[PDB]
């Protein structure tokens, strides 16, 4: 924003929003995978008790 005017700055800024918005989605997806296999182990310890 401190080197380009408003007419080609939006091309660059959008190229960076979607890039960072895709590294968050990847992080969330892996957590959904991990939480679904910890739960499969918390239902095994709840049965052993």
């Amino acid at each position: 924003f401190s080197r380009l005017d408003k007419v080609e700055a939006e091309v660059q800024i959008d190229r960076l929003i979607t890039g960072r918005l895709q590294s968050l989605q990847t992080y969330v997806t892996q957590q959904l995978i991990r939480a679904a296999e910890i739960r499969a182990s918390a239902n095994l310890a709840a049965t052993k008790m």
Binding site: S2, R3, L4, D5, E8
Partner: protein, 141 residues
């Protein structure tokens, strides 16, 4: 007559507008029938976050919390030497294309408005920096 006047009873109220975010409710007929603010109370804030006019019992997460800056400070080198742009452009002779000369500009204050002044400089298009934002940057060489 022309001086003085007698009038009836009346009252008028004055308020000032302000930038705000609202949530409005449209009925089946298409007219606004109710509205809720979004910056009046935390309850109204969570109503605005949940996009509902009623909230169920529980704990809800809402907008964040940040501190705004108070004053602005700018630090720049104090040199004020008025870079010799006129020497390059108002020269009486330019070298051949195969032996192009290179001049070095350093340790001075550069003003590109004097460049912008003369009309014949019609082709002025730039790649890495917008031509209208050269006055707010610092260059190493």
């Amino acid at each position: 007559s022309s001086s003085g006047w007698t009038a009836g009873a009346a009252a008028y109220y004055v308020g000032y507008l302000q930038p705000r975010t609202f949530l409005l409710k449209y009925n089946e007929n298409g007219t606004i029938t109710d509205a809720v603010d979004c910056a009046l109370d935390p309850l109204s804030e969570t109503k605005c976050t949940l996009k509902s006019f009623t909230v169920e019992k529980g704990i809800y997460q809402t907008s964040n919390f940040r501190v705004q800056p108070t004053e602005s400070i700018v630090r720049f080198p104090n040199i004020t030497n008025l870079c010799p742009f006129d020497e390059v452009f108002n020269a009486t002779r330019f070298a051949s294309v195969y032996a192009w000369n290179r001049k070095r500009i350093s340790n001075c204050v550069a003003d590109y408005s004097v460049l912008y002044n003369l009309a014949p400089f019609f082709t002025f298009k730039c790649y890495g920096v917008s031509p209208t934002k050269l006055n707010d940057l610092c260059f190493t060489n």
